[PDB]
Design a protein around this motif. Structure first.
Motif, PDB file in Angstrom:
ATOM      1  N   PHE A 181       8.440-108.525   2.290  1.00 28.62           N
ATOM      2  CA  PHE A 181       9.670-107.865   3.198  1.00 28.62           C
ATOM      3  C   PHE A 181       9.672-108.811   4.338  1.00 28.62           C
ATOM      4  O   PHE A 181       9.070-109.931   4.771  1.00 28.62           O
TER       5      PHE A 181
ATOM      6  N   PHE B 259      10.775-108.151   9.018  1.00 32.75           N
ATOM      7  CA  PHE B 259      11.142-107.092   9.963  1.00 32.75           C
ATOM      8  C   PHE B 259      11.120-108.133  11.165  1.00 32.75           C
ATOM      9  O   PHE B 259      10.371-108.704  11.624  1.00 32.75           O
TER      10      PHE B 259
ATOM     11  N   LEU C 282       5.797 -99.820  12.321  1.00 28.22           N
ATOM     12  CA  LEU C 282       6.168 -99.696  10.912  1.00 28.22           C
ATOM     13  C   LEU C 282       5.599 -98.475  10.116  1.00 28.22           C
ATOM     14  O   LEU C 282       4.619 -98.028  10.842  1.00 28.22           O
TER      15      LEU C 282
ATOM     16  N   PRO D  42      14.641-105.592   3.606  1.00 25.56           N
ATOM     17  CA  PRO D  42      14.210-105.370   4.794  1.00 25.56           C
ATOM     18  C   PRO D  42      13.448-103.713   4.929  1.00 25.56           C
ATOM     19  O   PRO D  42      13.635-102.984   4.072  1.00 25.56           O
ATOM     20  N   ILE D  43      12.541-103.712   5.908  1.00 26.50           N
ATOM     21  CA  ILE D  43      11.945-102.401   5.939  1.00 26.50           C
ATOM     22  C   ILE D  43      12.278-101.553   6.971  1.00 26.50           C
ATOM     23  O   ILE D  43      12.930-101.749   8.049  1.00 26.50           O
ATOM     24  N   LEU D  44      11.544-100.355   7.249  1.00 31.99           N
ATOM     25  CA  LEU D  44      11.820 -99.343   8.309  1.00 31.99           C
ATOM     26  C   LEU D  44      11.314-100.019   9.609  1.00 31.99           C
ATOM     27  O   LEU D  44      10.082 -99.824   9.608  1.00 31.99           O
ATOM     28  N   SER D  45      12.024-100.382  10.582  1.00 35.59           N
ATOM     29  CA  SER D  45      11.391-100.920  11.782  1.00 35.59           C
ATOM     30  C   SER D  45      12.071-100.088  12.935  1.00 35.59           C
ATOM     31  O   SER D  45      13.273 -99.801  12.928  1.00 35.59           O
TER      32      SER D  45
ATOM     33  N   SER E  59      20.557 -96.238   9.713  1.00 37.30           N
ATOM     34  CA  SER E  59      20.233 -97.163  10.721  1.00 37.30           C
ATOM     35  C   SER E  59      21.079 -96.591  12.127  1.00 37.30           C
ATOM     36  O   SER E  59      22.068 -97.163  12.289  1.00 37.30           O
TER      37      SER E  59
ATOM     38  N   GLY F 158      16.854 -99.250   8.511  1.00 33.25           N
ATOM     39  CA  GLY F 158      16.099 -98.435   7.372  1.00 33.25           C
ATOM     40  C   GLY F 158      15.982 -99.520   6.171  1.00 33.25           C
ATOM     41  O   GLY F 158      16.867-100.570   5.968  1.00 33.25           O
ATOM     42  N   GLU F 159      15.107 -99.003   5.139  1.00 35.21           N
ATOM     43  CA  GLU F 159      15.016 -99.935   3.883  1.00 35.21           C
ATOM     44  C   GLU F 159      16.366 -99.757   3.468  1.00 35.21           C
ATOM     45  O   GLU F 159      16.958 -98.752   3.091  1.00 35.21           O
TER      46      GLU F 159
ATOM     47  N   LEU G 185      12.069 -97.210  -1.123  1.00 32.58           N
ATOM     48  CA  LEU G 185      10.930 -97.550  -1.618  1.00 32.58           C
ATOM     49  C   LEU G 185       9.467 -96.773  -0.785  1.00 32.58           C
ATOM     50  O   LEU G 185       8.822 -96.419  -1.569  1.00 32.58           O
ATOM     51  N   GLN G 186       9.857 -96.411   0.387  1.00 27.74           N
ATOM     52  CA  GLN G 186       8.906 -95.623   1.361  1.00 27.74           C
ATOM     53  C   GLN G 186       8.908 -94.088   0.817  1.00 27.74           C
ATOM     54  O   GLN G 186       7.964 -93.730   0.421  1.00 27.74           O
TER      55      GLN G 186
END
Lengths: 322, 79, 65, 48, 31, 49, 49
Positions: B46, B48, B68, D1-4, D25, D35-36, D40-41
């Motif tokens: 990943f 971020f 996160l 990319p992930i949830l930041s 987002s 958001g991802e 996945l989350q």
């Protein structure tokens, strides 16, 4: 005749332990006396299969590890009263008149009802003790889930931060399913959660596949007990899986065998001295089986054994959330 | 011998006029210390960012942390 | 059983059962390859020896409609 | 990319909020979330 | 008794009534 | 007693034979699964093909 | 997935037949978790022939 009424005395709903659905988690054997039963341990010689798919790796194992499992005793008692004035009418065989015969058969019905009452409350006490012993063995679901998730990374060194991540992981797993059945009302999520319950356990050591079979070729792979409310909700929620088959419980209890190894112990002990000179029968009944991810689990309601008695069911606890 | 058959019991799915046998390899790989080759271990990476800027009477606020998620589902904090 | 477990002579010695337990050794769940569901993607043939099996190739004459 | 996420308020409105919010987002005046791209989350936290 | 400047962000997520998860010289890694 | 040690040795060698003849089949299914895993592409690969 | 594959060359139709007239057109293997989810997800299609 002054005035007639009607009086009626009901006979209670009888229940035997083997005919219950709970007996599909038991291997009950009628012994006689437990004075010669010395130890609590019982050795289980169990094999382990080894797959030979490595030319460079020989396993080189004996694969006959023995396990030691300790027992625990629990007596089950009941006081059993009987009026002796009726007992004199039976053990002395009165042959006087028709009124003597009527008091005779009334005393016979009295002692027969008392015997049926005590022999049926003994079985309910037996199911109570078996349920208590089985409740003193089951961990909560998140505990065994965190055990099987952290199986590959078990304890090799002392690591308190690893134990802290373990603590927060089963905290999240616990807060996920505190009251899951109260929370949601969709069938797929509770079916998936029940499947993750059913695949969380492990196999038992000695289990005959020929006993506890359905009408088809599906061996019963466990048992589920609950109270009235939860099992009624599950029965009215997943009726596409609940059906009523004919399961094959044992006919009577198993009878114990004596091993042929104490024979060669006794002959070897005679050599030190001066000189030498039912278990495979079955019966059908009716039970409701769920099909849960290629597994067949028996649902069972313990209402009919704990109804109208002032013994609180151990399956209804009282949690204290703050 | 080459043209003789036997029946057994198996669970078949019907999938768009096709019949595929589902089969579980648990009963062959249970209790052995040979890892099943059907359970691999992928390695996804990943990325971020933290502390960006957004171009253009209460003003806007410039970030300096980043929060996160977690495997244990707690809120993380990187700053 | 009387002469066997308890003994030959009842005088000057007896064979007394100290304490009995139960021991059990399970036999594992058997599995054959043909009876498995995986064998519906196989064409397994019992040969005898692979010394005379020279090459890795095998010619398949296949029609096309 | 992930949830930041920058502040915990947008975190606990995006995680307590509902389902399908993980792909949105939103950009505030100075705050921002991303958001991802695949779920996945919420495929892990909802399915348990 | 609690301060009025304490964030409501602490109360949304499940945590202790102490505020700490006696040495507060180490910081918190959870929050 | 000779007969009892005889039948016990028979059960011993029979259990050992069943253990090795059954672990051979599990190794055969392992090798067949490995050979079949070394032939399958991922789904998007054969889909793009 | 099932329509992505191709036929095999030599296959006897008389072997691997169901109780009805439906020839088995492949095989699917999986682990415990995935197959348990699929068994508890599509029980309108899963039956035991």
């Amino acid at each position: 005749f002054e005035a007639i009424f009607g009086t009626f005395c009901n006979r209670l709903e009888w229940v035997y332990f083997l005919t219950s659905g709970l007996a599909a988690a038991a291997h009950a054997i009628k012994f006689h006396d437990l004075n010669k039963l010395t130890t609590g341990k019982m050795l289980f010689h169990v094999q382990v299969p080894r797959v030979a798919s490595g030319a460079g790796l020989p396993t080189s194992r004996q694969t006959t590890i023995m396990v030691t499992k300790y027992s625990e005793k629990s007596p089950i008692t009941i006081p059993f009263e009987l009026s002796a004035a009726c007992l004199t009418y039976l053990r002395e065989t009165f042959e006087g008149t028709i009124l003597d015969k009527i008091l005779n058969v009334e005393a016979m019905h009295t002692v027969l009802r008392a015997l049926k009452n005590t022999a049926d409350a003994m079985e309910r006490g037996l199911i109570h003790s078996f349920l208590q012993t089985l409740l003193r063995k089951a961990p909560p679901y998140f505990v065994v889930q965190t055990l099987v998730e952290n199986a590959t990374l078990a304890r090799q060194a002392l690591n308190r931060i690893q134990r802290s991540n373990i603590l927060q992981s089963f905290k999240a797993k616990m807060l996920a399913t505190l009251f899951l059945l109260n929370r949601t009302r969709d069938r797929d999520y509770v079916l998936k959660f029940l499947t993750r319950l059913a695949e969380a356990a492990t196999d038992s050591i000695l289990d005959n596949p020929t006993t506890y079979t359905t009408s088809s070729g599906a061996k019963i792979s466990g048992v589920m007990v609950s109270t009235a409310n939860v099992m009624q909700i599950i029965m009215s929620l997943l009726s596409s899986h609940i059906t009523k088959e004919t399961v094959s419980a044992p006919a009577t209890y198993g009878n114990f065998v004596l091993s042929p190894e104490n024979a060669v112990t006794a002959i070897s002990y005679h050599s030190i001295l001066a000189d030498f000179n039912g278990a495979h029968s079955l019966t059908p009944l009716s039970m409701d089986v769920i099909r849960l991810g290629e597994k067949t689990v028996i649902m069972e309601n313990l209402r009919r054994v704990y109804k109208n008695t002032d013994t609180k069911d151990p399956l209804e606890r009282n949690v204290d959330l703050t | 011998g080459a043209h003789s058959l036997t029946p057994l019991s198996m669970d078949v799915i019907r999938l768009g006029e096709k019949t595929v046998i589902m089969e579980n390899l648990r009963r062959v790989y249970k209790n052995t210390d040979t890892k099943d080759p059907l359970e691999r271990n992928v390695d996804l990476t990943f990325f971020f960012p933290v502390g960006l800027y957004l171009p253009e009477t209460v003003r806007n606020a410039l970030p300096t942390t980043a929060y996160l998620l977690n495997r244990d589902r707690a809120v993380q904090k990187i700053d | 059983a009387l002469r066997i477990y308890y003994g030959d002579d009842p005088e000057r010695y007896n064979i007394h059962f100290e304490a009995i337990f139960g021991t059990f050794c399970n036999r594992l769940e058997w599995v054959y390859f043909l009876t498995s569901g995986l064998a519906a993607a196989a064409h397994a043939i019992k040969f005898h020896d692979l010394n005379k099996l020279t090459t890795g190739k095998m010619l398949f004459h296949v029609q096309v409609p | 990319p992930i949830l930041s996420t920058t502040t915990l308020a947008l975190m606990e409105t995006k995680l307590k909020g509902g389902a399908g919010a993980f792909a949105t987002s939103e950009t505030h005046f100075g705050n921002y979330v991303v958001g991802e791209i695949i779920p996945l989350q919420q495929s892990m936290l909802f399915n348990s | 008794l609690t301060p009025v400047t304490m964030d409501v962000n602490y109360f949304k997520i499940p945590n202790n009534p102490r505020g700490r998860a006696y040495d507060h010289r180490e910081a918190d890694a959870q929050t």
